[PDB]
Design a protein around this ligand. Sequence first.
Ligand code: HEM
Ligand code: HEM
Ligand code: HEM
Lengths: 187, 185, 186
Amino acid sequence: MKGTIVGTWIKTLRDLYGNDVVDESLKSVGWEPDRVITPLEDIDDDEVRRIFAKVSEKTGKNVNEIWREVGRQNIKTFSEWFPSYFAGRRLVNFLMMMDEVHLQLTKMIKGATPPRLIAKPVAKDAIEMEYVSKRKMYDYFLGLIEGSSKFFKEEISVEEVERGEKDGFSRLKVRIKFKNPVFEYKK
Amino acid sequence: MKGTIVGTWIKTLRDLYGNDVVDESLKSVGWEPDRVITPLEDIDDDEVRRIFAKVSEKTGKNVNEIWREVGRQNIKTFSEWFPSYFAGRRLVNFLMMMDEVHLQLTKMIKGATPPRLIAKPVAKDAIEMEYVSKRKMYDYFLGLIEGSSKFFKEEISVEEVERGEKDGFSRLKVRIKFKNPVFEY
Amino acid sequence: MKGTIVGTWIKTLRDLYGNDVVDESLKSVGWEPDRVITPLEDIDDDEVRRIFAKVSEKTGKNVNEIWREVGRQNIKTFSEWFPSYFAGRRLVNFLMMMDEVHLQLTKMIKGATPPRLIAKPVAKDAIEMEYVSKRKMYDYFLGLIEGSSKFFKEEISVEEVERGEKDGFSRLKVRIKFKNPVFEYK
Ligand code: HEM
Ligand code: HEM
Ligand code: HEM
């Protein structure tokens, strides 16, 4: 994982659960609590895994619930980093465009490997979006969608329709329903 | 053709010529007049061709003129679907970018095969746009250009300079003149 | 070089130093002073070099400072060509997106070959941008950066880190420092 996102995860945990929940979890993996992380350095994913587990232990929350909440928060932060990915979009545009956006981000943040997110309009008012990765961060995936709904102020319902691990990849498909048609024809 | 665009055509034909005309046209090709079409289903092009023919027969309007008008109307609709492809562009930007947008759309609407649109800055205040497709929807192409002009509120003159079915591909080249330079200083 | 860009430069040289310096510099390479330059014709690079050489000789200005000035001036023009590349971006966004933008320009302007511009966020408040080209227009590169800074109204500090030519390619690496973080939290 790139320092860019991780540095942000740390700071988001700090806002969510407090400083010396985060301080002590950081110590748990042998980091000084005020460790400075650079945007392009490589952080061991397992260290991140261990950090989030400790926060869970310390907070009484399941880690999946924490990843979800962090996913919710991060949409706003991403919107500050790259407002032009958000500007003038419908929510459904934003979600359908996200795989292509992640691909452009890999050309700008060397070594970044965001997941594949192929989205498909399956009905007049719904898409299916499939998360595909070597990393299995289902809950973060869902939180980011929820956070996207809040950012665009378009209500959705999200249902998991499929989950699975095949040939080294984690996969998760959701069906997302909107209040208006995806491709509405109007007067 | 993908149901996405076909569903839109049907509704556009209904607004233009009425429900009873479209229903009967749908029936004439063996569809429920109220056929439910999903965004990604594959609709036979020849059935669409026949629907449009029957509408022309019933309204008395030449089918070419029907395509041109459907093209004029559809620009508005596309701008409601994907407003960020329109926002902050000059018309000439919009037209020159259209080939890449159609490509990005193939990545979002699986199996869509919109025409190739080679656009070239040919003179200071003019471009050439070449439509290249296996479908020969000349008038529709011309309608979308006209619709874009109205949407961006930039008057243009468009002259067809080339028409022909070279390969398995139909091709149509137009010269598009703007009131502004393409690359204005 | 494509005529689209050469014509802009001619117009910029005229704005800066006047029609007489430019007219004589065009004649010097065998052009009519009012020769029409089409957006897609291909202009010989060495002719452009000699034109800029003659302008330097006639004005007394160092050719490097000329390219720098022209680069500063041109950002505003580019924003008139393609405002949607500037719209709603932060300066750091604009600079990191430029390589993909130059790549998409080659798809709209046939035969255009802008330099490769690899940018890397190297620190919390700075990026590295490496200019790489078959051509050697270091000062134009730097002026365009300064011009970007002015257009986006965001101050930067620019430091050269490395420059050099190998097997026909010129490279220039700068470090660009901002007043605000690249990936700001809250
Ligand atoms: C402009 C908005 C966004 C930006 C800038 C962004 C950026 C990133 C970055 C930089 C990474 C790091 C990859 C790495 O370190 O190797 C990442 C990972 C991730 N991104 Fe995006 N993201 C955005 C929106 C989204 C959205 C809407 C989703 C919705 C699913 C999403 C899903 C994920 C997930 C689940 C990961 C976790 C790593 C993994 O699953 O393997 N992102 N994102
Ligand atoms: C954002 C604006 C636009 C969108 C979203 C859009 C989208 C589409 C879609 C979904 C199709 C269906 C393809 C299929 O079913 O395989 C299509 C086909 C087509 N597009 Fe576009 N389009 C846009 C603008 C334009 C413009 C400006 C032109 C021409 C100047 C154009 C020319 C055409 C034509 C003529 C067809 C069908 C005819 C054929 O196959 O030759 N479109 N477009
Ligand atoms: C949206 C803004 C921009 C546009 C539309 C643009 C477009 C172009 C075009 C059309 C060319 C001519 C290619 C040819 O004739 O072969 C060019 C060359 C060049 N561009 Fe860009 N450019 C933009 C922004 C920038 C920026 C921010 C830089 C930053 C340095 C830059 C650096 C250069 C350089 C140094 C050259 C030609 C010299 C060489 O090969 O070294 N441009 N640009």
